Design a protein around this ligand. Structure first.
Ligand SMILES: Cc1ncc(COP(=O)(O)O)c(CNOCC(=O)O)c1O
Ligand SMILES: Cc1ncc(COP(=O)(O)O)c(CNOCC(=O)O)c1O
Ligand SMILES: Cc1ncc(COP(=O)(O)O)c(CNOCC(=O)O)c1O
Ligand SMILES: Cc1ncc(COP(=O)(O)O)c(CNOCC(=O)O)c1O
Ligand code: NA
Ligand code: NA
Ligand code: NA
Ligand code: NA
Ligand code: NA
Ligand code: NA
Ligand code: NA
Ligand code: NA
Lengths: 380, 380, 380, 380
């Protein structure tokens, strides 16, 4: 049973009652009880459980080879729920190039709650060991990262976490369960911004979490019910729907990624390309050992900010917008958009050069995408 | 101008573009930018803002005579966002009768983050003054309370909070903006489980928050954006739709409440009755001075839990389920359902006895509701 | 038992499986079969049946005291389905004041299929008897009519239709089942533009049909299934939700209607007033004998079309738009908007003059609605 | 600009106002007018136009290389609207193996309206010429047909229709605009059951129509507005969404179709296979000349009804359900399901043998689909 089949038949996404081939949308808040505490299908209040959300949860658990799924109103909310597994005084290590909003949440919210943070370049696993204190309880890793796609050894970070008694969390958003399964490599918790590839259609903001640990799942459920950043039923339905085409979409995206990178490597206006598919990429071997495909986010550097802006205006099929994982291919300038608050000279130290472009490859025709970007690069 | 008109025309709930009479459902995650940083209507990512969510936010702000609305995935998520205004070491005062889940969240979650909580009988405002510690930063009041309907003097608690530098928060869920407007009495933040009267149809789980404080609004926006417990667009739409009928629904409910209370006060199988409309009810004067109506939540004592169970089975129009503020009239035993997370000995001390019944009066015919409940109580 | 209770508990609008208090939205097209021909709940293809559509159908059947409900994509589609009960050569009688689009559909579409139509002044039932041809198979009545609110004797027209073997159809859109129940007076089929009062929130375009005739129901089901103008599940859900508040909304509307009519009768810039509540209105006795209330549609004459235009601009709470039965109060000029498809000379003969204004009274405050309309008419 | 790009960027499917990357869902019934007849974006009533429906219409028009799109509540409703282009006395020719519901509508509804019908085996174009009377106004062709996939020469049928003054209609449902574009070959009107491949997710019942003829479009619009079988906004949104993945889905489906047919042709329990991809198939050359891909519906004959039933029970990834074009692969027995009313001996004359199986190939893994069906055929 291969992935494209599991996508279609994995999880519970039909109606046992009527036999509907799609998950009913339970736009509802409460459920009648036959007697006090006697729930006929286990439902009592939609913050606690909702049959549509339970459906999407079952899907994410199945695809990530876990036992328990959780759906939150945003990826940010999923991350918050996971971090609220810790107490004041606990210490968490994250990779240093973590997504802007994850950094913002750990440093201007959860530090105010007495949670200690260390940001570490996890491209070398031993930096994690250097960072481990006796109060360390959680290790949190994106791979690949935004926007330079730095790869981290998932299996090694799981071994480190196991031996030091840490909760290991991988943020699988850029790879999707279709290409990378952190739970299979020993990670405790895997989470996604379902806003991207999973939803797939730029029409749902949601986060998903999956684990095989029963006691971790029980704590996650308690947090979800007591802080309430749950995904609504309509968005859960749209998420299930979106996930159906995930394999086909990721494979189209990957075909275009490969051709686009060959174009970028051959082009003169491009000084450097960041993507784990490139054999000179740091930890390319590690990535190929922990995934059987690629993310569709690519970064490449052109000479300056005005060649970036000109590339944006010269493209016909790349769309200037926030986010990634859309059907549309998206384009952006991290120096002017996501990393604008970071000053110029320090963002050169960080790698966010003035001419760094990030594309999120969509499901348009591969030749249209390659050709369009190449003619734009020929205008420079 | 008048309340029933304000419900229809207050806030922005039409489409400027097409002239549509109802708020469009912007089931979307991202927005096109004309130039880098150039947003056509101020939208760039749906976690940050979404036109349908902004519609509901504008409605709740208008109705509570504040300046800023916020829509969360649940009332519990609104409460979480407000509590995250505090830091480790800060102390919060709440009133002694609180919704089960608010108690659970503050005592089993935010204490782990070093936030101190004390539950204080605010029916006498001066008890707040004694309870204020030097680390007290927030005062949080339900009024009337769930499930005993204890009244607290909102204007007095606002004066106290101003004089000691506390953020005053009122949880106006039971009264709705139709009858009670805490911001107009000096409160800093007003909160709702929009799951109840506002949504009105048992089909949306959501929270709403409103303030006139610009800097509190900015901190709330930062929290919502960094933890992501945002209300989705479909639920935001359904909330606006529901809020339209709010006045008509509350006025039916009040008509029915009056007759049901006279019935309960006269009935032999009914012991104590809890509702602020009763002249012997503690702080009844206070309630009539701060509200223009009554909540539809009523609590009353029967002899024991199995007389509760039999009363529940004998009713034909009261539905055994959690939550309140629906069109259906609802019935429950708070000790065994909504307030089970409150410890037993405290629930006995407070009066939330095993035979305490809570009804939420709906919009069915008043005579059907009175007769049905009375014929059922004649069974005991 | 009583109407306000029937609105809440009549029909099947809960989930038997999970106990959900609201009708699930079965956004689905097909259903699993356990064996060939073995349907788990009787569903096999969503054009034929859909559980959410069946929910709304059960509601309208219950409310109209019939046995069979039908949900169409629009009221016009319900009318089409009913007219398709006839064959080429059959003759239908309609009342002389009909909604613009019903006129357009019967005279510009179904005549091309050899269906003969005659518009007859049914305010005197005996005019029907003269109009009956040997090819007459159907009698079709709006009451009150759009936009002149002409009353027709429903019980008398049913007796006539029974005695001559005609299918009697009443278009109960203006009255709603809350106030008038044609099936209870012998009519065969009752029809609604559910777009109006039933939906209630200007957010659903839909039609509903109800009958107790088993064989008419079977022919209607065959027509709906073979021409496919079925109501979708999301709109069916929103219709159920809307119908919940129908009694409360109609009762507000009626309270406002009474005061607005006294204002209009007294105003100097207002000539004739059309509404069945007026004692001098033709067949006012008849209306009070067949209904327990009044529609919120009022028509009245101002001097000319530009006094209409100025009255429209001067109002603050009346909205210039098509349709009726919304929470917003609406205002229009039928001659130039809804009834423009009716030929001009017939519209002048009938009284649908260029200065005929139609308001649909909404649920805003009665005093705001009276004062606003009167201050605007003081402008002429 | 290749097909997979056109799918993503063809048509208007973003919000000009806010810049949302997806079509807003206009759950609304009416739109305010600035003055009488002055519509700010051309909208006045949602039966007439609705921005979400206008979006989907634009998509279908673009993909079929037409100028005008129309969205109906069902494919059946689209077909009815097209047939209502004719008048009593007009004559239409359809292919003899037309879909059950199209046959049912033409013969038990539209014949009652004086429309004459001839059902003709259009696999030889000259049978059309034999059938042409002087009253013939319309030619209506499915290709390939259900369930034996008979191919008809589209370009030739267009030439015949042009020379005899007929409205040519092709029912492109089985091929989708991705593989066959009848308008490009001279056909006047092309229609789809969007319930199948276009929607793609078994969650929308809808029909779509596309033409380049301005006067035909004007008539179609008049019919749509006066009979009202319009697609609702939520289903239009879901249709746009579904159409995004159409190319990827059709290509996966086609890869599996080819492998599955090689398996079926090689298997002993299979006596005969029906699919236009087979070179011995009647008019295979014609199909390859008018399409650049294949439908995913395949028929094959096994010995008897009990080998069909056993094949259904023995498969793990083929699902017994009505309809086609799902993500799930579907399986059925036409003799016992769609063609059950037709007697046994005459269905042998028709080709609907007792052992005829129809599969609708989904987007599961190709090897899982081939293997699963082959092991089932090895159980016979
Ligand atoms: C790992 C991870 N988690 C979370 C997120 C975001 O989570 P959420 O779904 O709440 O937006 C992102 C992406 N955030 O991008 C927004 C942008 O491109 O401006 C992400 O990469
Ligand atoms: C006063 C109050 N505030 C806040 C909340 C939290 O709201 P939410 O459930 O939307 O998260 C609730 C939730 N009540 O729910 C079940 C019940 O008591 O019958 C509440 O009652
Ligand atoms: C009495 C009546 N019946 C039937 C119908 C048809 O209903 P629908 O628009 O849902 O197809 C209508 C539609 N009215 O619409 C605009 C207006 O008159 O203000 C109607 O008024
Ligand atoms: C050409 C065509 N038009 C129309 C249709 C059906 O149109 P609609 O979308 O109204 O179902 C079909 C398929 N109908 O199948 C239903 C089934 O498999 O039982 C079709 O092939
Ligand atoms: Na399954
Ligand atoms: Na493990
Ligand atoms: Na307004
Ligand atoms: Na203030
Ligand atoms: Na019922
Ligand atoms: Na009868
Ligand atoms: Na476009
Ligand atoms: Na042409």
């Amino acid at each position: 049973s291969n992935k494209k089949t599991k996508l279609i038949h994995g999880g519970h996404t039909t109606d046992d009652y009527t036999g509907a081939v799609t998950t009913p949308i339970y736009q509802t808040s409460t459920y009648l009880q036959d007697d006090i505490g006697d729930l006929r299908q286990g439902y009592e209040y939609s913050r606690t459980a909702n049959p549509t959300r339970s459906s999407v949860e079952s899907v994410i658990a199945t695809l990530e080879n876990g036992k328990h799924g959780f759906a939150f109103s945003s990826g940010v909310a999923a991350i918050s729920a996971v971090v609220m597994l810790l107490d004041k005084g606990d210490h968490i290590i994250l990779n240093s190039d973590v997504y802007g909003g994850t950094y913002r949440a750990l440093t201007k919210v959860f530090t105010r709650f007495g949670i200690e943070v260390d940001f570490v370049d996890t491209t070398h696993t031993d930096s994690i060991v250097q960072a481990i204190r006796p109060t360390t309880k959680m290790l949190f890793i994106e791979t690949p990262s935004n926007p330079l796609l730095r790869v981290t050894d998932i299996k090694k970070s799981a071994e480190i976490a196991k031996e030091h008694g840490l909760i290991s969390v991988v943020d699988n958003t850029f790879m999707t369960p279709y290409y990378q399964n952190p739970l299979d490599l020993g990670i405790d918790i895997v989470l996604h911004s379902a806003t991207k590839y999973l939803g797939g259609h730029s029409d749902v903001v949601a986060g998903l979490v999956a684990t095989s640990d029963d006691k971790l799942a029980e704590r996650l459920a308690f947090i979800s019910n007591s802080t309430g950043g749950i995904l609504g039923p309509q968005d859960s339905y749209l998420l299930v729907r979106g996930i159906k085409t995930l394999g086909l979409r990721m494979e189209q995206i990957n075909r275009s990624v490969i051709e686009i990178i060959k174009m970028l490597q051959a082009h003169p206006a491009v000084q450097q390309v960041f993507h784990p598919s490139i054999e000179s990429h740091l930890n390319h071997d590690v990535h190929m050992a922990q995934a059987d495909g690629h993310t569709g986010v690519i970064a490449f550097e052109v000479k300056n900010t005005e060649s970036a802006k000109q590339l944006i205006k010269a493209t016909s099929y790349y769309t200037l917008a926030e986010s990634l994982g859309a059907v549309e291919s998206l384009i952006s300038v991290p120096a002017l958009m996501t990393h604008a608050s970071i000053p110029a000279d320090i963002r050169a130290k960080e790698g966010i050069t003035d001419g760094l472009v990030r594309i999120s490859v969509g499901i348009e025709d591969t030749e249209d995408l390659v050709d369009d970007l190449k003619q734009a690069l020929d205008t420079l």
